[PDB]
Amino acid sequence: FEGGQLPLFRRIPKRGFTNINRKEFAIVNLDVLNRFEDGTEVTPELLVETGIIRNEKSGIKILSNGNIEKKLTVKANKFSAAAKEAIEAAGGKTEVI
Amino acid sequence: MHVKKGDKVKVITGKDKGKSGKVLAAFPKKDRVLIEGINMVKKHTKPSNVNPQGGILNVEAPIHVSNVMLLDPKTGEPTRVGYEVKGDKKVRVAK
RNA sequence: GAGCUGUACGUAAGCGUUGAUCCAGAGAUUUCCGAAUGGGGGAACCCACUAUCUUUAGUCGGAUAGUAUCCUUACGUGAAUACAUAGCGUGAGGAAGGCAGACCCAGGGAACUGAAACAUCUAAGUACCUGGAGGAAGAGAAAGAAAAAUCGAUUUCCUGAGUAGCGGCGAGCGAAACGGAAAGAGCCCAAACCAAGAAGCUUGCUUCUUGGGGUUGUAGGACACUCUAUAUGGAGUUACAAAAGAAAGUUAUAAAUGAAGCGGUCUGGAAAGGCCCGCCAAAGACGGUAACAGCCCGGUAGUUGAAAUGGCUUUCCCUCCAGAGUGGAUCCUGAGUACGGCGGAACACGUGAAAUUCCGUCGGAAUCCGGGAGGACCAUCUCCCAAGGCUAAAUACUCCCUAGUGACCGAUAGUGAACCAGUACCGUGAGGGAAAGGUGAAAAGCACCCCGGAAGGGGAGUGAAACAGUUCCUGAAACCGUGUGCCUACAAGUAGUUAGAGCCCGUUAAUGGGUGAUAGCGUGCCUUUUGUAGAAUGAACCGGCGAGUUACGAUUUGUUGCAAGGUUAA
RNA sequence: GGGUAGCGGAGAAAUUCCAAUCGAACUUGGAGAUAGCUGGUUCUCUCCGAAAUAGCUUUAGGGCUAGCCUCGAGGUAAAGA
RNA sequence: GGUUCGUGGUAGGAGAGCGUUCUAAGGGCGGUGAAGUCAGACCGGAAGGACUGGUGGAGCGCUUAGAAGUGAGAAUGCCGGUAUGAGUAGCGAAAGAAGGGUGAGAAUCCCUUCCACCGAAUAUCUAAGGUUUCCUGAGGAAGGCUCGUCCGCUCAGGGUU
RNA sequence: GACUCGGUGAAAUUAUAGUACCUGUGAAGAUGCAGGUUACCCGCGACAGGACGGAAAGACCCCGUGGAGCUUUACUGCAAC
Ligand SMILES: [Mg+2]
Ligand SMILES: [Mg+2]
Ligand SMILES: [Mg+2]
Ligand SMILES: [Mg+2]
Ligand SMILES: [Mg+2]
Ligand SMILES: [Mg+2]
Ligand SMILES: [Mg+2]
Ligand SMILES: [Mg+2]
Ligand SMILES: [Mg+2]
Ligand SMILES: [Mg+2]
Ligand SMILES: [Mg+2]
Ligand SMILES: [Mg+2]
Ligand SMILES: [Mg+2]
Ligand SMILES: [Mg+2]
Ligand SMILES: [Mg+2]
Ligand SMILES: [Mg+2]
Ligand SMILES: [Mg+2]
Ligand SMILES: [Mg+2]
Ligand SMILES: [Mg+2]
Ligand SMILES: [Mg+2]
Ligand SMILES: [Mg+2]
Ligand SMILES: [Mg+2]
Ligand SMILES: [Mg+2]
Ligand SMILES: [Mg+2]
Ligand SMILES: [Mg+2]
Ligand SMILES: [Mg+2]
Ligand SMILES: [Mg+2]
Ligand SMILES: [Mg+2]
Ligand SMILES: [Mg+2]
Ligand SMILES: [Mg+2]
Ligand SMILES: [Mg+2]
Ligand SMILES: [Mg+2]
Ligand SMILES: [Mg+2]
Ligand SMILES: [Mg+2]
Ligand SMILES: [Mg+2]
Ligand SMILES: [Mg+2]
Ligand SMILES: [Mg+2]
Ligand SMILES: [Mg+2]
Ligand SMILES: [Mg+2]
Ligand SMILES: [Mg+2]
Ligand SMILES: [Mg+2]
Ligand SMILES: [Mg+2]
Ligand SMILES: [Mg+2]
Ligand SMILES: [Mg+2]
Ligand SMILES: [Mg+2]
Ligand SMILES: [Mg+2]
Ligand SMILES: [Mg+2]
Structure with a gap:
């Protein structure tokens, strides 16, 4: 409350x-x-058993933050273009499920 | 109560401890007991119908039962009391 | 198992081991009023009638029973009106009223208040009224939730989430499903059809009654067909049909038994306390006892116990009972219903794009090739089968009972009420509503003397104490007095403070105490104010009581644990 | 002896009366209504220490943000005086 | 451990503490006298704390921690007590007097005489309303605006055909 | 009635008071502050100038996004017709 001055929230539009x-x-x-x-x-x-994700909302997406070292065969619901270009770069196969 | 009228008791607490006597009355509602020659008080009595001349009467006042132990008529000693069922009626026993 | 005739600080007459008083179970009696019910009535009163006894020479009296109203039902009688029917009478059942101001369901339903006004909205479907009531109620076995390519009645808790949403898009209001738990249980009808009647002329066909049959989804049933059961088995009064009883076990409602110190000394009125010795402990719970006791008492742990009544649990009796498969020719599967319009309400959802649910009013389907839902609506797909009923448990509350507990109160507190309190008192009434606990271990409650009419007192005596003396533990302050060390009748005083003679004392003994001639200085306290000694506010005084708390969220700091992890809720 | 009762009665009318209450009785409840107003709010010492302004406000004796106080922390060619 | 600069303060921020009730644990005091209460010339920077003596007659400290109905001088606060005003206002319409009696005590009770007042009432009935106030005996704490031997008061007994 | 005596015995009020006057001063009208001026201690009967005396949280006046009653061609409603 602003003592009768229109409150900030009412000066600005819903979006x-x-x-x-x-x-x-x-x-x-x-x-x-x-x-x-x-x-x-x-x-x-x-990734559940290891406890890296506890809840899998919608699915697992892989993103490219940091850098990978091990030739894995990762399968997740989605992939960052960069993540897919970094798993393969090491020498691994990405498949979507 | 562990003693009744006519029993010989020992007094074990108070100004008359070590003195024995014959329970003259029992007041079980108050857990009190009147012992012959024990807890003698001086009653300042107006003349009335009973004691018509009046006077300062020396008489017995009740003692709390927990302050008397039953005299085993065998050994003439104070005792705690048990209860044994002898055919018809249960009877007090000593220790 | 010895005392007893309630309290309560009396007299009298009595009772009791031939078992009292007392405790528990069962029974009897139970005036009058009260729904109050024979009629009436200003509750606790008045006055009857009908039988049947009873009293009197008869009136006059007495006793016992019946006699309200409505509902349902049977049987009789029975008008206008001919049969009827209404009406009337009698006999069966049933109701009525109360309340636990709780909890629950339903009808009806505010306002203050919030929105910094206010009307939509909020408060709130709250308070309150009325009805139904039950030990719980309500809900409930999908025309569901969903969107795995799946759940399987309802309820409650955690969570979802202060999310999605609703909203003068303001103030505010605010879900659900999924997930996790508690608890779990499923069933009976209506209808096809079958049988047997009655009633009807539809006149050999329909409409009602009772029984059998039968209960569900790309289906189930009827119906045909066949296979086994016709109590072999199964089930049950908590739904699934409904009354009945027995027996044994157990629990409750009275109780019984129950170890060990009169230990020695000290102080003391008294020892349970100190000191010094022992002992019991499945018992060191609690209470009492002349101060604080495991060993003094009632008891406690442990172990026994019930004639009677009730509850629960088993078992027996008793009662009751058909289940599979195969075919979809035909038949059935809840109608003024579902839906729709209009007006409202409930849904978190304020008419919105408004699904879903209910009410009033009007309109009004399909009806197995059928129907509903998935948030307007259509199509597809999926899930489901309404318009009939029943159903325990997990949940809510506490007038009560039993056993207990409390970093709850301790007499202005805690209940309004520790005490004969919903009393006294106030009020026409509804209704409002107090104050008030403590002698002592024991009455041993003050014989006797003295003054006094008494009250009251002084002695004497009791008691540890009476300066504990029947409103009697302690006994503060205000306030009222008596006595006297210092000062005081030439003084102008917010009362003190600093300086200070004199006089009187002598302490927690230290550059002490009381008083204060005289001198200097000096405008209470609080509140509120720019500013108050204020001629502004508040307080007569003293005492008690009397105001930032808790819950759940948010945020930030500190602490601790673990750390890309941390943490569980019910 | 009776009747009319508060969103109401009664009134040869005054806002007059309805139990010493009446421009809307009394009582209990909603209810601890609400009160931007007044009053009040209880132990001690230590360190610091304001404001009585601006803007906006159905706002003007209220409020909000800013200014001015305080506590902690940070960085900081010290930027302040 | 020392130098330097500081230490007036309302609203208000920050800090450290005092004391109260209760709990836990530990350690104590106390009938050779607990708490409370009274007194004092003691101790600490404050809140406050001791010690000694009286009263009192049975419980209470201390330490560390914990928890709060945790501190009053003000609210025209609430309740209780007690002042002040003050021996003051008042003692509620009115005619009494003396003698005698009663009694511990008499203006105030009883009796006598005189006096005075009401008399369309201040008389006599009765209804309402009250509900024992009526009668007798005893009483004089409280009530009665004084007093009180008296009473519509207190206590017993009675009394309504 | 007052007053004196005997009996009985309230109240409002009240921060504590050893409670003069004048002129000044001050929240602008002082018993209480300053400078002076007066004044032995304690009462009784009287009188009301002052204690901005007592009584009643001013009825006037303003304020409050306080009420209430009343009006209407204020707004929105409702009964009734
Ligand atoms: Mg938009
Ligand atoms: Mg009757
Ligand atoms: Mg407002
Ligand atoms: Mg024993
Ligand atoms: Mg001794
Ligand atoms: Mg004692
Ligand atoms: Mg004791
Ligand atoms: Mg529909
Ligand atoms: Mg509609
Ligand atoms: Mg709604
Ligand atoms: Mg639809
Ligand atoms: Mg409709
Ligand atoms: Mg859809
Ligand atoms: Mg939706
Ligand atoms: Mg169906
Ligand atoms: Mg009380
Ligand atoms: Mg007390
Ligand atoms: Mg006393
Ligand atoms: Mg002179
Ligand atoms: Mg002199
Ligand atoms: Mg003055
Ligand atoms: Mg005042
Ligand atoms: Mg916090
Ligand atoms: Mg007028
Ligand atoms: Mg009146
Ligand atoms: Mg309310
Ligand atoms: Mg209030
Ligand atoms: Mg400073
Ligand atoms: Mg505006
Ligand atoms: Mg300084
Ligand atoms: Mg300072
Ligand atoms: Mg104490
Ligand atoms: Mg307090
Ligand atoms: Mg006070
Ligand atoms: Mg006077
Ligand atoms: Mg006078
Ligand atoms: Mg006079
Ligand atoms: Mg008179
Ligand atoms: Mg005349
Ligand atoms: Mg008389
Ligand atoms: Mg008198
Ligand atoms: Mg008399
Ligand atoms: Mg006089
Ligand atoms: Mg002067
Ligand atoms: Mg005068
Ligand atoms: Mg005045
Ligand atoms: Mg005013």
Whole structure:
């Protein structure tokens, strides 16, 4: 309350809407995939057991933050172009599920 | 109560400890007991119908039962009391 | 198992081991008023009638029983009106009223208040009224939730989430499903059709009654067909049908038994306390006892116990009972319903794009090739089958009972009420509503003497104490007095303070205490104010009581743990 | 002896009366209504220490943001005086 | 451990503390006298704390920590007590007097005589309303605006056909 | 009635008071502050100038986004017709 001066929130307009079908993904930056031992294929359920993601909202997306070292065969629901260009760069196969 | 009228008791607490006597009355509602020659008080009595001349009467005042132990008529000693069922009626026993 | 005839600080007559008083179960009696019910009535009163006894020579009296109203139902009688029917009478059942101001369901339903006004909105479907009531109620076995390519009745808790949303898009209001738990349980009808009646003329066909049958989704049933059961088994009064009983077990409602110190000394009125010795402990709970006790008492742990009544649990009796498969020719599967318009309401959802649910009014389907929902609507797909009913548990509350607990109160507190309190008192009434606890261990409650009419006192005596003396533990302050060390009748005083003779004292003994001639200085306290000694406010005084708290969220600092992890909720 | 009762009665009318209450009775409840107003708010010492202005406000004795106080922390060619 | 600069303060911020009730643990005091209460010339920078003696007659400190119904001088606060005003206002319409009696005590009770007042009432009935106030005996704490031997008051007994 | 005596015995009010006057001063009208001037201590009967005396949180006046009653061609409603 501003003692009768129109409150800030009423001076400025409402914006946008909420998408009913919004999809938020669980993020897994590369640096945390170094936790796995070379040759291993990395599925969602494996990322649960290791405790890197606890809840898998919509699905698992892989992003390119840091850098990877181990030739993994990663499979996640989505991939950053950069993440896909960095897993292969090392010598691994990305497949989408 | 562990003693009744007619019993010989020992007094174990108060100004008359070590003195024994014959329980003259029992007042179980108050857990009190009147012992012959024990807790003698001086009652300043106006003349009336009973005691018509009046006078300062030396008489017995009640003692709390917990202050008397039953005299085992066998050994003439104070005792705690048990209860044993002898055919018909239960009877007090000593220790 | 020895005392007893309630309290309460009396006299009298009595009772009790031939078992009292007392405790528990069952029974009997239970005036009058009160729904109050034979009629009436200003509650606790008045006055009857009908039987049947009873009293009197008869009136006059007495006793016992019946006699309200409505509803349902049977049987009788029975008008206008001919049969009827209404009406009337009698006999069965049932209701009525109360309340636990709680909890629950339903009808009806505010306002202050918030929105810094206010009307939509909020408060709030709250308070309150009325009805139904039950031990719980309500809800409930999908025309569901969804969108895995799946859940499987309802309820409650955690969570989702202060999200999605609603909203003069203001103030505010605010879900649900998924996920996790508690608890779990499922069932009976209506209808096809079958059988047996009655009632009807539809006149051999329809409409009602009772029984069998039958209950569900690309289906189930009827109906045909076949296979086994016709109590072999199964189930049950908590739904699923409904009354009944027995027995044994257990629990409750009275109780019983129950170890060990009169230990020695000290102080003391008294020892349970000190000091010094022992002992019991499945018992060192609590209380009492002349101060603080495991060993003094009632008890406590442990172990026994019930004639009677009730509850619960088993078991028996008793009662009750058909289930599979195969075919979709035909038949059935809840109608003034579902839906729709109009007006409202409930849904978190304020008419909105408004699905879903309910009410009033009007209109009004399909009806297995059928129907509903998935948030306008259409199509597809998916899930479901309404318009009938029942159903325990997990949940809510506490007038009560039993056993307990408290970093809850301790007499201005804690209940309004520790005390004969919803009393006294106030009020026409509804209604409002106090104050008031403590002798002592024991009455041993002050014989006797003295002054006094008494009250009251002084002695004497009791007691540890009476300066504990029947409103009696302690006994502060205000306030009222008596006595006297210092000062005071030439003084102008917010009362003190600093300086200070004189006089009187002598302490927690230290550059002490009381008083204060005289001198200097000096405008209470609080509140509120630019500013108050204020001729502004508040307080007669003293005492008690009397105001930033808790819950749940937010944020930030500090601490601690763990750390790209941390943490669980119910 | 009776009748009319508060969103109401009664009134040869005054806002007059309805139990010493009446421009809307009394009582209990909603209810601890609300009160930007007044009053009040209880122990001690230490360190610091304002403001009584601006803007906007159905605002003017209220409020909000800023200014001025305080506590902590940070960086900081010290930028302040 | 020392130098330097500081130390007036309302609203207000910050800090450290005193004391109260309760709990825990530890350690104590106390019938050879606990708490409370009274007194004092003691101790600490403050809140405050001791010690000694009286009263009192059974409980209470201390330490560390914890928790709060945690501190009053003001609210025309609430309740209780007690002042002040003050021996003051008042003692509620009115005619009494003496003698005798009663009694511990008499202006105030009883009796006598005289006097005075009401008399369309201040008389006599009765209804309402009250509900024992009526009668007798005893009483004089309180009530009665004084007093009190008296009473519509207190206590017993009675009394309504 | 007052007053004196005997009996009985309230109240409003009240920060504590050893409570003069004048002129000044001060929140602008002082018993209480300053400078002076007066004044032995304690009462009783009287009188009301002052204590901005007592009584009543001013009725006037303003303020409050306080009420209430009343009006209407204020707004929005509702009964009734
Ligand atoms: Mg928009
Ligand atoms: Mg009757
Ligand atoms: Mg407002
Ligand atoms: Mg024993
Ligand atoms: Mg001794
Ligand atoms: Mg004692
Ligand atoms: Mg004791
Ligand atoms: Mg529909
Ligand atoms: Mg509609
Ligand atoms: Mg709504
Ligand atoms: Mg639809
Ligand atoms: Mg409709
Ligand atoms: Mg849709
Ligand atoms: Mg939606
Ligand atoms: Mg169906
Ligand atoms: Mg009380
Ligand atoms: Mg007390
Ligand atoms: Mg006393
Ligand atoms: Mg002179
Ligand atoms: Mg002199
Ligand atoms: Mg003055
Ligand atoms: Mg005043
Ligand atoms: Mg915080
Ligand atoms: Mg007028
Ligand atoms: Mg009146
Ligand atoms: Mg309210
Ligand atoms: Mg209030
Ligand atoms: Mg400073
Ligand atoms: Mg504006
Ligand atoms: Mg200085
Ligand atoms: Mg300072
Ligand atoms: Mg104490
Ligand atoms: Mg307090
Ligand atoms: Mg006070
Ligand atoms: Mg006077
Ligand atoms: Mg006078
Ligand atoms: Mg006079
Ligand atoms: Mg008179
Ligand atoms: Mg005349
Ligand atoms: Mg008389
Ligand atoms: Mg008198
Ligand atoms: Mg008399
Ligand atoms: Mg006089
Ligand atoms: Mg002067
Ligand atoms: Mg005068
Ligand atoms: Mg005045
Ligand atoms: Mg005023």
